[PDB]
C-alpha cells in the first residue's frame, strides 16, 4: 500500500487523532465537554485531511491505484472513532464519497477528502460557536 514518507506522514497524522480522542476519553448538544471534544477532535482530524490532500497531490503523477486506495482506507478507519464521539454519519460521508469518486487516482482521493474536510469544518464551527 502506502510507502515512504507518505506512509509515515499519513499514519502519524491519523494516530494524532486517536491520541487526542484517547486523551479526551480519559482526560476527565449542550454538554460543555462534548462541545469541546468535537472542536478538539475536528481540529486534529482536519490536519489529517490536509495531509491526505497534500500527499495525494504530491503523488498525482507517480502514485499507483493501491496507494490512493490506501489513503481512503485510512480515512475510513479514522472516521470510526470520530463517529463514536458524536459526529454522526462521519463514516457514511467518506464511504458515500468513495462510491461517487473511487480512490484510484489522486483526483479521486481529493474529492473524498474535500467532502470529509467540509464535514469536519461544519462540525468544528457549530460546536465552537455554541461555546459562547
Amino acid at each position: 500500500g502506502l510507502t515512504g514518507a507518505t506512509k509515515i506522514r499519513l499514519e502519524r497524522s491519523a494516530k494524532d487523532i486517536t491520541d487526542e480522542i484517547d486523551a479526551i476519553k480519559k482526560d476527565a448538544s449542550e454538554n460543555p465537554f462534548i462541545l469541546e471534544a468535537k472542536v478538539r477532535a475536528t481540529t486534529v482530524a482536519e490536519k489529517f485531511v490536509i495531509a491526505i490532500e497534500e500527499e495525494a497531490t504530491k503523488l498525482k503523477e507517480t502514485g499507483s491505484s493501491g496507494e490512493f486506495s490506501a489513503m481512503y482506507d485510512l480515512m475510513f478507519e479514522v472516521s470510526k472513532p470520530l463517529q463514536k464521539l458524536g459526529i454522526q454519519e462521519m463514516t457514511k460521508t467518506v464511504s458515500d464519497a468513495a462510491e461517487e469518486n473511487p480512490p484510484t487516482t489522486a483526483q479521486g482521493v481529493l474529492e473524498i477528502a474535500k467532502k470529509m474536510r467540509e464535514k469536519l469544518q461544519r462540525v468544528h464551527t457549530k460546536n465552537y460557536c455554541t461555546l459562547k
Partner: antibody
Amino acid sequence: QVQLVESGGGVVQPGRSLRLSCAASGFSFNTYAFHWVRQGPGKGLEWVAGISFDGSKRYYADSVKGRFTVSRDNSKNTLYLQMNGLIPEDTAVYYCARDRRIVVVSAPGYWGQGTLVAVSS
Amino acid sequence: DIQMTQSPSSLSASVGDRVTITCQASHDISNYLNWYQQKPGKAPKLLIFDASYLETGVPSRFSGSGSGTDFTFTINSLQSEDIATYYCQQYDTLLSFGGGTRVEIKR
C-alpha cells in the same frame, strides 16, 4: 456473476495443518478485502479472520489468533487460510467472503459455498 | 472485546405477523452493525447494513433500527420463505456475530 469457491476440506488429524483456498472470478479482486467465517455443525457463525484489500493488515479472532494466518495472492485471484495445530473444536464449514464495500473491511457481502473441515483421527 | 448478545434464541410466528429481533452490544459500536439471514442449507445473506439501511434487492418487508448498544431487526409481514436463522454482526472492534435467532413458521 460473482463466484467464490472454497477448497481443501476433508479429514485432518488433530494437531496437524490444513490449508484452505478460495477462487475469485468474477469481479475486481484487488479492490476488495476478504473474510473467513466458519460455522460448526448445528452452531452459529464465528468470524475467524480478515485481510485488507492490500495484504498489509490481517485480523484474527481471539479463538484463532497466533494459530491461523490469512493471505492473498492478487496475481492468482485466490485467498488463503493457513490452519496450524488443529483441534476438534475447529470442525466447521469454512466460508470465504468478499467484503460488501470497496477497499475497506466492514462486512462479508458475497459468500462462497463453504468447505467442511473434519478434525478427526 | 465486544460481546453481541442476540434475543430471542428462537421464535414461532405465523405468516403475516410482524417479527422483531434484538441485538445488544456490550459496548458502544455506533451503527457499525449488520443483519444477516441464513436460510437452511445456504450461506448467510446480508439484509441490513449499518443497522438501518436496506441492502439493494432485499424486499421492503425487512427493516432495521438502532444505534449505540441496542439494535432491532424487523420483518413487517413474515413470509413462509423467510424461515431462517438471523444473525447480527458488528464491525466496531474486529468482526463478530451474535448467537443468532431461529425463526420458525406457525401454520
